[PDB]
Amino acid sequence: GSAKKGATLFKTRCLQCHTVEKGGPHKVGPNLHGIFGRHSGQAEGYSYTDANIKKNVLWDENNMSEYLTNPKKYIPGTKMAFGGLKKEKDRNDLITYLKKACE
Amino acid sequence: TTPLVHVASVEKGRSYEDFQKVYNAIALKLREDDEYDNYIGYGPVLVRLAWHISGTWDKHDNTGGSYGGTYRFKKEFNDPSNAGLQNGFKFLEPIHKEFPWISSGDLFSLGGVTAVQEMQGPKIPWRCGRVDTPEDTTPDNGRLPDADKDAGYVRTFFQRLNMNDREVVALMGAHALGKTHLKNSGYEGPFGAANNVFTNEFYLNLLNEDWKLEKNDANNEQWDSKSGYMMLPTDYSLIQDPKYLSIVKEYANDQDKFFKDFSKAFEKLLENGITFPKDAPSPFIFKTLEEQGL
Numbered sequence: 001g002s003a004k005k006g007a008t009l010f011k012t013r014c015l016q017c018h019t020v021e022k023g024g025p026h027k028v029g030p031n032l033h034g035i036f037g038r039h040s041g042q043a044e045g046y047s048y049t050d051a052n053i054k055k056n057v058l059w060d061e062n063n064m065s066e067y068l069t070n071p072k073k074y075i076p077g078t079k080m081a082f083g084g085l086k087k088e089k090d091r092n093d094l095i096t097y098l099k100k101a102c103e
Numbered sequence: 104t105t106p107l108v109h110v111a112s113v114e115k116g117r118s119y120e121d122f123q124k125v126y127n128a129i130a131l132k133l134r135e136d137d138e139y140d141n142y143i144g145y146g147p148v149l150v151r152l153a154w155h156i157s158g159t160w161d162k163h164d165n166t167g168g169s170y171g172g173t174y175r176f177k178k179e180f181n182d183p184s185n186a187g188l189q190n191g192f193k194f195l196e197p198i199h200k201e202f203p204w205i206s207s208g209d210l211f212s213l214g215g216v217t218a219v220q221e222m223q224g225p226k227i228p229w230r231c232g233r234v235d236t237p238e239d240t241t242p243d244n245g246r247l248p249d250a251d252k253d254a255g256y257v258r259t260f261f262q263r264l265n266m267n268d269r270e271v272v273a274l275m276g277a278h279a280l281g282k283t284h285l286k287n288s289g290y291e292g293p294f295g296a297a298n299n300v301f302t303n304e305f306y307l308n309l310l311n312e313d314w315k316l317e318k319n320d321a322n323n324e325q326w327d328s329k330s331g332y333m334m335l336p337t338d339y340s341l342i343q344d345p346k347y348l349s350i351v352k353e354y355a356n357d358q359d360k361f362f363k364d365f366s367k368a369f370e371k372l373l374e375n376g377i378t379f380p381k382d383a384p385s386p387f388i389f390k391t392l393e394e395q396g397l
């Protein structure tokens with residue numbers, strides 16, 4: 001996918017609630033640094049819903065795609081108020097960008 | 104000659120299944136045109152359009168309101184208060200051509216309901232029957248509220264729409280959606296975090312964020328949070344007024360309650376000035392794209 005297009009999608013649809021940089025501040029949602037290959041609900045300092053912790057999944061590019069399609073569907077009771085990326089192209093672009101941005 | 108009365112009249116040979124397909128067309132276009140306004144989508148502007156075409160109502164002589172579909176005429180179209188709603192109108196344009204039988208008033212109000220539902224808001228019962236009225240029935244400009252006011256102004260203004268304290272606080276929760284644009288209203292910035300998902304964040308943000316009153320690029324004064332949000336003076340006055348403040352805390356602690364009250368208030372808003380006869384069908388609750396499998 002296009003990381004630069006994915007950069008735009010993050011800036012307009014994610015940035016208001018999430019930062020990507022290492023040691024970046026918690027906001028509406030948790031910092032997403034090192035999010036891939038980490039268990040859900042494990043960002044230190046952040047207060048998750050227990051539904052997010054109960055889901056208990058190591059985040060990878062496939063479950064991220066499903067989650068971002070419909071967050072309430074993948075994790076019922078989540079407090080992430082996000083409609084969902086309904087275009088697979090945008091999910092591929094976003095995840096591509098997020099892959100490196102939060103390394 | 105007797106007070107002006109607007110009798111709901113169902114579009115000839117149209118029923119619930121017909122309006123679901125209009126709903127579907129609106130909802131699908133909402134889903135697919137996701138780039139508008141930096142990926143906010145058309146959701147918020149459709150809600151604003153529905154409230155603006157309804158908010159011209161005057162309870163004292165039944166002038167204005169959603170019935171006549173009078174937004175389609177230039178006098179109401181070019182209302183400075185309505186700047187930006189052209190986008191919502193052009194959005195609904197291809198849908199109107201696909202369903203030319205639906206009245207302008209029915210389409211505008213249905214767009215708002217669809218938007219609220221698709222944005223995961225509460226279910227809003229909706230009634231058809233609005234009928235297009237001539238161009239001289241169009242309300243004069245200036246019937247919509249100003250932003251640089253206080254709670255006293257707000258309470259007083261909504262008397263004209265027959266809305267009480269709870270209904271006002273509920274309806275204002277719609278400012279969880281979308282943003283202000285400088286070239287439209289002289290105010291700039293997102294109201295909250297979730298721009299196109301219907302939540303009770305309006306109430307939570309008012310109470311829990313740190314706000315400061317400052318001048319924007321239009322030299323208008325608005326409340327800005329350190330978290331990057333903004334609120335109009337009329338919005339912030341809901342925590343400056345004691346009676347408003349109680350209801351604000353209520354909806355902030357209970358989204359379910361807020362959804363219930365908003366649904367009532369919004370439908371009331373869209374139906375003000377309308378007389379529904381006895382033969383009229385029961386209000387419609389439309390199926391979202393989500394529960395249709397999309």
Ligand code: HEC
Pocket residue numbers: 009010013014016017018028029030032035039040041042043047048049050051052059068077078079080081082094296297298
């Ligand atoms: C607020 C308005 C948000 C927007 C827009 C987006 N996210 Fe979010 N996110 C938010 C919250 C409050 C939470 C926690 C949910 C809970 O139940 O506790 C989340 C969660 C995530 C996660 C999972 C993090 C983890 O399990 O540690 C991810 C990976 C995530 N969010 C990413 C993400 C993306 C990619 C977004 C846009 C495309 C996005 N979020 C929007 C708050 C909000």
Ligand code: HEC
Pocket residue numbers: 147148150151154186187248249250257274275277278280281282283284285287288289290335337369
């Ligand atoms: C039931 C719905 C509703 C009610 C009631 C309502 N608003 Fe809003 N208004 C909206 C929505 C939704 C937006 C965001 C539109 C967008 O993002 O395109 C908005 C945006 C605005 C804007 C900026 C529009 C722009 O594009 O710059 C102003 C100004 C405004 N509202 C004023 C008010 C005032 C003042 C009141 C009451 C005293 C009020 N509104 C009540 C729904 C409502």
